[PDB]
Design a protein around this ligand. Sequence first.
Ligand SMILES: OC[C@H]1O[C@H](O[C@H]2[C@H](O)[C@@H](O)[C@@H](O)O[C@@H]2CO)[C@H](O)[C@@H](O)[C@@H]1O
Ligand SMILES: [K+]
Ligand SMILES: [Zn+2]
Lengths: 221, 232, 232, 121
Amino acid sequence: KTWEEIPALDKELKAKGKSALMFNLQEPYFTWPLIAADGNAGAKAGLTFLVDLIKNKHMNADTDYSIAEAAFNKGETAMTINGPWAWSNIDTSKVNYGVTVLPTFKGQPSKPFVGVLSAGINAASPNKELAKEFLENYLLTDEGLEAVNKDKPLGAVALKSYEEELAKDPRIAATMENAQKGEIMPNIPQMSAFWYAVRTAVINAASGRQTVDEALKDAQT
Amino acid sequence: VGLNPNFSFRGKQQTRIETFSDAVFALAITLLVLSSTIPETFEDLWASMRDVIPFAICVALIIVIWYQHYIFFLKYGLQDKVTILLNTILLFVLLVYVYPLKFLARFLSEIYGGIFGIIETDLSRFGEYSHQNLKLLMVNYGLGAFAIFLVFSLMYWRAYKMKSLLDLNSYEIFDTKSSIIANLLMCSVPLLSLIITLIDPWGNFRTTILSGFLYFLYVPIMIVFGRITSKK
Amino acid sequence: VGLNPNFSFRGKQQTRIETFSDAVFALAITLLVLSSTIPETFEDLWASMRDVIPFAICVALIIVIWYQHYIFFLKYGLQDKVTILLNTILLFVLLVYVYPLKFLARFLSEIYGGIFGIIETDLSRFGEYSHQNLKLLMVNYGLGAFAIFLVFSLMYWRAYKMKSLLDLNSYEIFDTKSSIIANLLMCSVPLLSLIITLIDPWGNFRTTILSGFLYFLYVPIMIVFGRITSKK
Amino acid sequence: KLVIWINGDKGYNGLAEVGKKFEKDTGIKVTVEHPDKLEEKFPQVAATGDGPDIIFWAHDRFGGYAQSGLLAEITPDKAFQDKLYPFTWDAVRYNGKLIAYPIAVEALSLIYNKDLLPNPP
Ligand SMILES: OC[C@H]1O[C@H](O[C@H]2[C@H](O)[C@@H](O)[C@@H](O)O[C@@H]2CO)[C@H](O)[C@@H](O)[C@@H]1O
Ligand SMILES: [K+]
Ligand SMILES: [Zn+2]
């Protein structure tokens, strides 16, 4: 239920040839919840713990999406942090998995960033009215979102009619539990530069180049 | 059969904790009745039939607990150490208050027997009706009832703490969350009487009149505490 | 095993109400026997063996009720609040008349023991054989038996009220409808004695001779009430 | 061609399978049709045009067809008559003449979802 009891669980699991937690450390979307759990002091507190996990050899330095997914699906790690879309590949593997609330850090909960998958029409396209038709009358329908959800889950779909089917899923309940503890991303044009500044800051601190205090200095600029 | 249509009943197969627990429940209602002496003469026979009203109240109260137990183990189907622990705390309480309930049910049936005018038999048999005994009477059964509902709340929260392992959906999360508040609200009335009797604001029977009067205002006081949490 | 070939047995899997109910049934036949004092000497040993005839009648009567319970929960497999309620009313009655049956079984075994000429032990031990006690004797066990069969009728009707939910077919509807009439007809004889004893037409033992004589004319009087409903 | 008229809310595909077994044993084609408003299209078409060889509808509409002279009198042998319930044969009888073959007794009932409503009104 807490991040601070993972090192103990990893010491217990490494004795049996297994890891405790493997998740994508390269992309900052997956590390941000732990980083923004307390809050600044909250980012410094959050990132120092993440660095200590790698410094204590609990987590590998270059842990990407592919080696973390493969490790969880193979049954080499006990846990992983991923979104709705990731469940279909676990169902395919012979793993009895469970989706739950993200662990708390310093008592407070880990605040992930809530995304809304959205389809936008390209301004330099001659097929604008044909795409509108497709998006409206075919994709954003009970039959259209079903075809996509059975391939790889969409998450808590925006379609009002799906409310009962989403409320019947134990995993969508855990997704909404984390979404309420998190917050929706502002769409602003500066998000690109922000996401780049956090991506570099996490990689430098994880590999062992820049200090945690100097990472937030370069990222705040 | 079932309470909710959205709930998926995990404990539909019968288990050792459930069997063991029924056995204790069956014994409580059975020994409460059959702990009585065997009639050897018509006088003993008519005496034992006056005990049905007190016993009917006792059994009615015990099966209500048995029902809440049945529904809990039907919903979640739990069988862990902490569930085994809390469950024992429950059947342990049940067991210690079996005979004291026989006592209270008899005592209250003679007071109400005197009020309605059905019978006019003495109450000196029961001891000295003094302020300290009548205070200890409330505090005892109040503590007893509070424990039962407190344990039920603790058991629904243990299921809630294991919501992901049981694979509870949003409808099943809300039921479990509502069942805790329901049992805590049920344990707030005996706790409030118990607290009022122990402090003793008046230092006389008035204290026991109030503490007893909270049970007659059970539904309305449970609605006040429930509204306070929703109003904020 | 089963009563009807057209009936589809819903309650073939064992449940909490069934387990709990067996436990109470097992206790009634067990405590009726084992509530007796432990023989400490040969004199106590021979005394306790005279109790087998009374106890054999008690157990024979209790398993007959256990059978009707087993058959009901085998047929319908019900587990609802109203079934849980009626079932408790049943096991509650069973429980209160366990020891009074031990008393009646002993009492009737000494009267029949005197008639057949096997024994010649006194009946002064049982109290004052007066008109009011012998009247209260009928009214008591009559009320007891009537309740049991009245509850069984109420339980078959609760199943009938849920005929569509249980998916009862025309053969299963007719069985359920026949089982109500069967249990109401069984509860008509103790009810008729009970009513005759309470009114007391003669004001003497004649009243108790008649009320007792309706049990010896059980089958013929059950056929009269059954024929009256079919003749119209 | 043996053409049959029956309502679209009935088992016409099943009635066609009986019709396909008929063509195997005899050689006569059996097409099943389900036109809209057939209860009021049958007396207009059958009176003037050819219409169907056999019409399936509840017995209540057949007295009007019998009075109008749109139905042939049924003459079934005793052995066949005995196969059905004697009360069903009365429903298809107008002025002492059998005007149709009784298939089945129909009656509306309350259909209910046990999941949304276990104890219905
Ligand atoms: O890692 C930073 C990256 O995070 C988010 O991207 C998510 C995307 O939203 C998910 O749907 C999924 O595809 O994973 C991506 C991370 O791998 C932000 O949306 C994106 O701006 C940002 O670059
Ligand atoms: K004893
Ligand atoms: Zn016992």
